[PDB]
RNA sequence: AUGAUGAGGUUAAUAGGUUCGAGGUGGAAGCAUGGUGACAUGUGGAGCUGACGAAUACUAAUCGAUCGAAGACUUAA
RNA sequence: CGCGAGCUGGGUUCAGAACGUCGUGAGACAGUUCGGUCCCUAUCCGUCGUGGGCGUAGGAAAUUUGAGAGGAGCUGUCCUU
RNA sequence: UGAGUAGCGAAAGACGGGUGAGAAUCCCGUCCACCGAUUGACUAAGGUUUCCAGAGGAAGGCUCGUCCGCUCUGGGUUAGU
RNA sequence: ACCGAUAGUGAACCAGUACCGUGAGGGAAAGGUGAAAAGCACCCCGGAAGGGGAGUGAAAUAGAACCUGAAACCGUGUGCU
RNA sequence: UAAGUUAUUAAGGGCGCACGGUGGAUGCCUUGGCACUAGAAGCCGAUGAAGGACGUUACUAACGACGAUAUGCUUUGGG
């Protein structure tokens, strides 16, 4: 089927309300100091210690 | 499917070449009318 | 099976035999989280068979394991079965199961699919 | 003052980049490196570049402390698009828009 | 479908492995014996066994992080 | 004569061919017979399932009442009197 | 606008090691799978420089790309039968 | 008392050209930095592209996509809601 | 305690404004064309024409010029 009527740019931005993407869910490494991704291995420096 | 252009150098020059246009009164008209327009390629 | 791996039965079984052989050849590999969650349960049972030791336990190992030779024995050439029944078995002869461990790395580029480092414990 | 960096005519559609930019907008700049470094998306590396450049414009050629820096204003504008073609069936042809973007980040110290 | 719903996150039985069973198959390999041979018998309801029941911290649910209240206004009691 | 952006294409009314018949003829039926491309990714309303936000004058967990709304609602036969 | 929607063109890859700013995809290797009256070998037409080496990765490649039939720089076709 | 870049020749510009067609044949689009290239030394981020400074210039929101720079369209922030 | 009244939230959206990007309208301009006027002249070729192909430069894709004497040769004048 075809759209019978173009979408007003208010309805477009209403539909795009939930199209946001979420944070990565990250923590501070207790060895690296830099940030890691929880339950993952520190890309920056070394081990996982779990 | 077999399409309509099946290239062939011999046929192309035998049927549209220069010597085949220079053999007719109308081939000569063709070449003169392409020179009136100033084409780069006269024959093929 | 637990989880179809986006493959077909013969194709998936070949996949898992290859991964298991490579794991006990290299003792640690980087793979995808689901492939690892399956290679886990495959190589666990292979090393159980290795710990058993009997000949039928060897011929059963010899059907779910590939045929590679380990050139880098310092001029020695082990097959994967000889490796699995000497070294891996004699190593893990104390603990009662749980012979590997999976470590998440992060999202692979080009898929966003998580990468894991499955290795022998 | 307010330092800024720009990346003009990056080859990513700008409304794919606005997704990532809606995460770092207003964060302590010490976080924003790691946030962009940890997320799945593809527009994150080419924004890590622009952010690190706008932060290396704070220490150098101005004199600011790059701990005191929040990402005051990040955003992305449209660039020139590259209009291509894709042959559909039956002689039809559909246009393609390989769009671009200008990624602008402005870090400040709040003074 | 995803989210949500529930069961758990070590002070732990949530999933995998391990040891037992349940059910399914139907007598594993090797060896000895009889046949010259295809085979048969014993060792032996044996050996294998995905999803079902139980126990066992061996592996992984680490460490952390966020959100979330201080109780309006009259009137009568 | 509900329903083909749900299905079919058997009849009737596309090009082929034939019978009877009307027409000098090209051709036509009161007819009859064999064959013959049924496209669409759902924007809005509607419908069916499912989440998020805020509201419900503090912030929560659990158990509920029921204003309403929906579902079901059929029937024979044999024995006894 | 439709919309971050349909599509990404029949099919088996896996892992190790390299290179590198960046690797599911590039190079190497082992294993696995597919064709095998053919997905192999040689040729006519036709194309016309796409062939090779060393660099490159703005565009093309339905993703990626450090790679390429693409970009740059150099080269390569030898007949008395 | 002709046009002034959708105008004027199809063609202000390497135009009867890209391109399209077996062929005859059809056929576009494409002007403007500054007075003068003085066309951005050097530093910093980055693989580069691109930036931020310092410069040249009367002017760089005149940086070779280079006079003015509208509308559609796409964004960032806020005053009322 | 009870009965009543009333908001603040804005996931987002609306209008106003401020600031930016694409985009190439408008303004001004000309190495280009259009319509004529006055004056010439109105043919070229077997002593090879018009039109081309291939080449020619220190480094040459292409454009103009040139033809193995080739990015040009001699002479007559001007400058």
UniProtKB/Swiss-Prot annotation, chain B:
This is Large ribosomal subunit protein bL34. The lineage of its organism: Bacteria, Bacillati, Bacillota, Bacilli, Bacillales. The gene is rpmH. Pfam families: Ribosomal_L34. GO terms for biological process: translation. Belongs to the bacterial ribosomal protein bL34 family. Keywords: Ribonucleoprotein, Ribosomal protein. HAMAP family: Ribosomal_bL34. One of its GO terms (cellular component) is ribonucleoprotein complex. NCBIfam families: rpmH_bact. PROSITE patterns: RIBOSOMAL_L34. It comes from the Bacteria. InterPro entries: Ribosomal_bL34, Ribosomal_bL34_CS. It comes from Staphylococcus aureus (strain bovine RF122 / ET3-1). One of its GO terms (molecular function) is structural constituent of ribosome. Residues 1-44 are annotated as: Disordered. Signal peptide: none annotated.
């Amino acid at each position: 089927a075809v759209p019978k009527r173009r979408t007003s740019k208010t309805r477009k931005n209403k539909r795009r309300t939930h199209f946001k993407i979420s944070v990565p869910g990250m923590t501070e490494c207790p060895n690296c100091g830099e940030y890691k991704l929880s339950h993952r291995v520190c890309k920056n420096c070394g081990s996982y210690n779990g | 499917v077999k399409r309509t252009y099946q290239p062939n150098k011999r046929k192309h020059s035998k049927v549209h070449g220069f010597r085949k246009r220079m053999s007719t009164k109308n081939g000569r008209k063709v070449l003169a009318r392409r020179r009136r327009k100033g084409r780069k390629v006269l024959s093929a | 099976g637990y989880r179809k791996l986006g493959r077909t039965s013969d194709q998936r079984k070949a996949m898992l035999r290859d991964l298991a052989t490579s794991l006990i050849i290299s003792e640690r590999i980087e793979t995808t989280e689901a492939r690892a969650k399956e290679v886990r349960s495959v190589v666990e049972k292979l090393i159980t068979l290795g710990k058993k030791g009997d000949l039928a336990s060897r011929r059963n190992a010899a059907k779910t394991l590939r045929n590679v030779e380990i050139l880098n024995e310092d001029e020695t050439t082990q097959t994967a079965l000889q490796k699995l029944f000497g070294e891996i078995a004699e190593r893990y002869t104390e603990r009662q199961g749980g012979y590997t461990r999976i470590l998440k790395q992060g999202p692979r580029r080009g898929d966003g699919a998580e990468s894991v480092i499955i290795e022998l414990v | 003052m307010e330092a800024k960096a720009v990346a003009r005519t990056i080859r990513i559609a700008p409304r794919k980049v606005r997704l990532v930019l809606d995460l770092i907008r207003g964060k302590n700049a010490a976080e924003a490196i790691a946030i962009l470094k940890l997320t799945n998306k593809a527009s994150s590396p080419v924004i890590e570049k622009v952010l690190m450049s706008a932060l290396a414009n704070a220490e150098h050629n101005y004199d600011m402390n790059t701990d005191e820096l929040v990402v005051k204003e990040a955003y992305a504008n449209e660039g020139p698009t590259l209009k291509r073609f894709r042959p559909r069936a039956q002689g039809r042809a559909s246009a393609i828009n390989k769009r671009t973007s200008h990624i602008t980040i402005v870090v400040s110290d709040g003074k």
